[PDB]
RNA sequence: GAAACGGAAGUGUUUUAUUGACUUGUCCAUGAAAUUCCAUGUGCGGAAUCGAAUCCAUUGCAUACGACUUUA
RNA sequence: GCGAAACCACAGCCUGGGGAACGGGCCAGG
RNA sequence: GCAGAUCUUGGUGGAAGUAGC
RNA sequence: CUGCCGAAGUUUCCGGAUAGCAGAAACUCAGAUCAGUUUUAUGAGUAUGUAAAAUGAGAGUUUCUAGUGGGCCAUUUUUGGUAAGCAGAACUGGCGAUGCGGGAUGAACCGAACGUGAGGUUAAGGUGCCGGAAUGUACGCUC
């Protein structure tokens, strides 16, 4: 096993209005609800259900029931931001978001560069 | 006020297709147990006053004119003031000689004729 | 023949006033736009100016072969591609009369209408090509300066497998 | 989401009722559906449960045992088979045991709404259709359970060849500078 | 040949109906890619067509079309209600329809 | 022109030898239009032919009759 | 070879249910 | 002013080329 | 042939006289009355009744003049019960003169009562497929 519901483990919200926002579990209300919080101001401290989040592989040490400001201090100290981003999971998610933002002209450009890339076709005999 | 028909199908008498002795002219069913009189589901419709058509567009042909029956040249001249409202319809028993006279007169009056080509030939 | 011979059902005074068409904010002059219908469907063209309802549109005739044309604003997709410089070219000559089809006069005799001895053709005059060349000359440097845009207008837009227009942005 | 002309479904681990209802709706939607590995379907309930259900069915008709004939019967009951629309929809379904040669070289999809691992609670007894069929009359279980390894070995060899071939372009991808020069578009 | 198809694929599922009464004047259309009633708001008012071929080469062509428009969404899964110029035949259940991008508000 | 592989219903996976082209890999020059605002060999009926089958020489092996099995 | 008559609302494969037979005629199936 | 009255008169069917002579 | 009105289906004596229901005529009458309604308080015994408030509707008539003089589904209150069911009164409405959505199908169950249509929105029921509609969300029981 690599993902255990634990105090301090970083989770990714996949349902609700805060979809795609990182958060860290601070307390376990029950087997169906967990108290999470994120240092960024756009994510208020709240209780979320386990079915609305996915469990990440990053564990960062927090005291039980830590307040919002101290969570941010630990988050900055343990550089969770740019640690999650280093993993290929976040890079795939960020690329998907960037690719969704491409307009028609950008899509035409991508087709041109990917054709310039594909015409490489160099393989050793 | 374009012509609107609430219904175009006719009202056929119930069981008129089953029996050749029964005509298709509408007859109001009188049987109490008959499902057509009780107006069940899937059964044939019945003539109701709600099916009646607009008074302004009633009796009007699809071109907006009302058919006026004509038997001689006197009847055609009657539509001098109503050529935008009425179309001349020559009767079926008017001979081909009178039909010609009616058709030339209606042409000068600017009156549409519904059956202006009947019983005649053309020669240009 | 002048005094009305019938009831003369004169229409009641209708309180309808003609007011200018409010086009979309994305259909500005100079924005690259995708044609949706007509013989030039799928082409990408530059919006010179907005007529009363239509957009006086043209692709550079040396690029995609779309002449000075009108397009209804409903049959066009306003893409977010970088805008072209179109303020230079005067567009006052493009009015509804400029694009209006020639009215029927038909000077003939009843000797050549029979035998079809008329052959009436109204091929595009030289001034229309001159206007197209003038617009092309004033537009080509603008599309040449910004990269990847000259052949972008030459390409034809199309939908591939998995394309969801309600999700894709243009 | 989107439809293909022919959809091949690998019925391994799919519940009988959940897959049949999805397939029947797709058949009525105007699609040709091929279901392979029909002997690997799962039914909720213990072995004895559906055993008595099928034994009672034998008491009742043309009793069919083959796993595809079981699945074909389940799909048919979810179709308006008394009308021309239902019959036409039925003819677009091709259910077979195993993966025949025309289909083992084609991509096979799965139905998440019918998968056992996502619908049945862990620790619940289940009865495989192929095993259930083997004792009620079906006699080709052993030979199809032996041929699958031959198909798997050939398919595994194909995947290794494809993966080895892909490694060349994958290495050549990062080799080309233009891959990262204009990778700001997310590609 | 992937330089065409300015339209979106769709399927003619059925008419609007209750359990036992059908209303052929309005048809239920499943636009592919549209998976909810909020995404069905993009395709409202768009022209939809049914394209079929008939034996006679009338008009010097082998193809004829029935046009229509998308009126409102149907249900929660992204199906829409379409009214065609001529009511779609009942034989076209499960057939393919084309949803253009015009009249466009994009 | 090909050789290999593919048996579960292989009917397709490659390997190519060349012979020609497009080569969007990229940079230019021409042509597009008054469509001047959407409408989009195959089948039948005849013959001259080649085989096969039945009836047929038949037969009871079959048998109300049909129909069946052998042999001219 | 000659040559009827009775009879005739109309079709016609089964298992269950449709409460008033429901059946053959409805509903659900084979 | 008809669909009925085991309605009246006339014509004609399926049974049926059946029972049969 | 179409349109409009439209029952009773039962008190009382006793085949009827009735009454009552439904229409026609002759009236007068809002500064007036009427009501399958609720009241105020006290009269009597929460119910019951009272005269005069709220709400709605204009009402009261006189004359004669067609049709009916049953039942069923039963509910509820209710008496006797009697192995136990069940039977007996009244009451209540409906069906009976009533199509429609649902109830798998359905003479009496849940909605709803009807001119011909377009659009919208619902009721009762429902949204795995047959079958129009979430293989929706959250919390539990069961294999």
Swiss-Prot record, chain A:
- Tell me which InterPro entries the record gives: KOW, Rib_uL2_dom2, Ribosomal_eL14, Ribosomal_eL14_dom, Translation_prot_SH3-like_sf
Kindly list the residue ranges recorded as spanning the membrane: none
Going by the UniProt record, its keywords in alphabetical order are: Cytoplasm, Nucleus, Ribonucleoprotein, Ribosomal protein
The family note in this entry says: Belongs to the eukaryotic ribosomal protein eL14 family.
What does the UniProt record say this protein does? Answer: Component of the ribosome, a large ribonucleoprotein complex responsible for the synthesis of proteins in the cell. The small ribosomal subunit (SSU) binds messenger RNAs (mRNAs) and translates the encoded message by selecting cognate aminoacyl-transfer RNA (tRNA) molecules. The large subunit (LSU) contains the ribosomal catalytic site termed the peptidyl transferase center (PTC), which catalyzes the formation of peptide bonds, thereby polymerizing the amino acids delivered by tRNAs into a polypeptide chain.
PANTHER family (UniProt xref): 60S RIBOSOMAL PROTEIN L14, LARGE RIBOSOMAL SUBUNIT PROTEIN EL14
Q: What is this protein called?
A: Large ribosomal subunit protein eL14
State the organism named in the record: Schizosaccharomyces pombe (strain 972 / ATCC 24843)
Curated annotation (Swiss-Prot), chain B:
GO process terms (BP): cytoplasmic translation
Keyword Ribosomal protein belongs to the record: yes
Q: Name one Pfam family in it.
A: Ribosomal_L32e
Phosphoserine occurs at which residues?
A: 74
Q: Which UniProt keywords apply?
A: Cytoplasm, Nucleus, Phosphoprotein, Ribonucleoprotein, Ribosomal protein
SMART domains per the record?
Answer: Ribosomal_L32e
Q: Which residues cross the membrane?
A: none
Give Gene Ontology CC terms: cytosol; cytosolic large ribosomal subunit; nucleus; preribosome
Q: Where would you find this protein in the cell?
A: Cytoplasm; Nucleus
The protein's matches in InterPro entries, at most eight in alphabetical order, are given as: Ribosomal_eL32, Ribosomal_eL32_CS, Ribosomal_eL32_sf
The UniProt GO MF terms for this protein read: structural constituent of ribosome
Query: Which PANTHER family does this chain map to?
Result: 60S RIBOSOMAL PROTEIN L32 AND DNA-DIRECTED RNA POLYMERASE II, SUBUNIT N, RIBOSOMAL PROTEIN L32
Leftover remarks: There are 2 genes for eL32 in S.pombe.
**What does the protein in this record do?**
Component of the ribosome, a large ribonucleoprotein complex responsible for the synthesis of proteins in the cell. The small ribosomal subunit (SSU) binds messenger RNAs (mRNAs) and translates the encoded message by selecting cognate aminoacyl-transfer RNA (tRNA) molecules. The large subunit (LSU) contains the ribosomal catalytic site termed the peptidyl transferase center (PTC), which catalyzes the formation of peptide bonds, thereby polymerizing the amino acids delivered by tRNAs into a polypeptide chain.
Protein family? Belongs to the eukaryotic ribosomal protein eL32 family.
Q: What is this protein called?
A: Large ribosomal subunit protein eL32A
- Gene it is expressed from: rpl3202
From Swiss-Prot, chain C:
The UniProt entry, under Pfam families, shows: Ribosomal_L6e (PF01159)
PTM sites of type Phosphoserine: 80, 90
Q: Which GO terms describe its cellular component?
A: cytosol; cytosolic large ribosomal subunit; nucleolus; nucleus; preribosome
Primary localization: cytoplasm
Location comes to: Cytoplasm; Nucleus; Nucleus, Nucleolus
Q: Which UniProt keywords apply?
A: Cytoplasm, Nucleus, Phosphoprotein, Ribonucleoprotein, Ribosomal protein
Q: Where is the signal peptide?
A: none
The molecular function terms of the Gene Ontology recorded here are:
RNA binding; structural constituent of ribosome
Mark the transmembrane ranges: none
Q: Which CDD domains match?
A: KOW_RPL6
GO terms in the biological process aspect are: cytoplasmic translation; ribosome biogenesis
Per its UniProt entry, which superkingdom is the organism in?
Answer: Eukaryota
The job of this chain, per UniProt, is described as: Component of the ribosome, a large ribonucleoprotein complex responsible for the synthesis of proteins in the cell. The small ribosomal subunit (SSU) binds messenger RNAs (mRNAs) and translates the encoded message by selecting cognate aminoacyl-transfer RNA (tRNA) molecules. The large subunit (LSU) contains the ribosomal catalytic site termed the peptidyl transferase center (PTC), which catalyzes the formation of peptide bonds, thereby polymerizing the amino acids delivered by tRNAs into a polypeptide chain.
What family does this chain come from, according to its entry? Belongs to the eukaryotic ribosomal protein eL6 family.
Q: How does it assemble?
A: Component of the large ribosomal subunit (LSU). Mature yeast ribosomes consist of a small (40S) and a large (60S) subunit. The 40S small subunit contains 1 molecule of ribosomal RNA (18S rRNA) and at least 33 different proteins. The large 60S subunit contains 3 rRNA molecules (25S, 5.8S and 5S rRNA) and at least 46 different proteins.
Identify the gene encoding this protein: rpl6
UniProtKB/Swiss-Prot annotation, chain E:
Q: Which GO terms describe its cellular component?
A: cytosolic large ribosomal subunit; preribosome
Listed A to Z, the keywords are:
Cytoplasm, Phosphoprotein, Ribonucleoprotein, Ribosomal protein
Q: Which domain of life is it from?
A: Eukaryota
* Main localization of the protein described in the UniProt heading: cytoplasm
Does the keyword field hold Ribosomal protein? yes
Q: Which GO terms describe its molecular function?
A: structural constituent of ribosome
Please report a single Pfam family linked to this protein. Answer: Ribosomal_L35Ae
Cell compartment(s), UniProt: Cytoplasm
> Its family?
Belongs to the eukaryotic ribosomal protein eL33 family.
- Protein name as catalogued: Large ribosomal subunit protein eL33B
Give the organism, scientific name.
Answer: Schizosaccharomyces pombe (strain 972 / ATCC 24843) (Fission yeast)
Q: What is the lineage of its organism?
A: Eukaryota, Fungi, Dikarya, Ascomycota, Taphrinomycotina
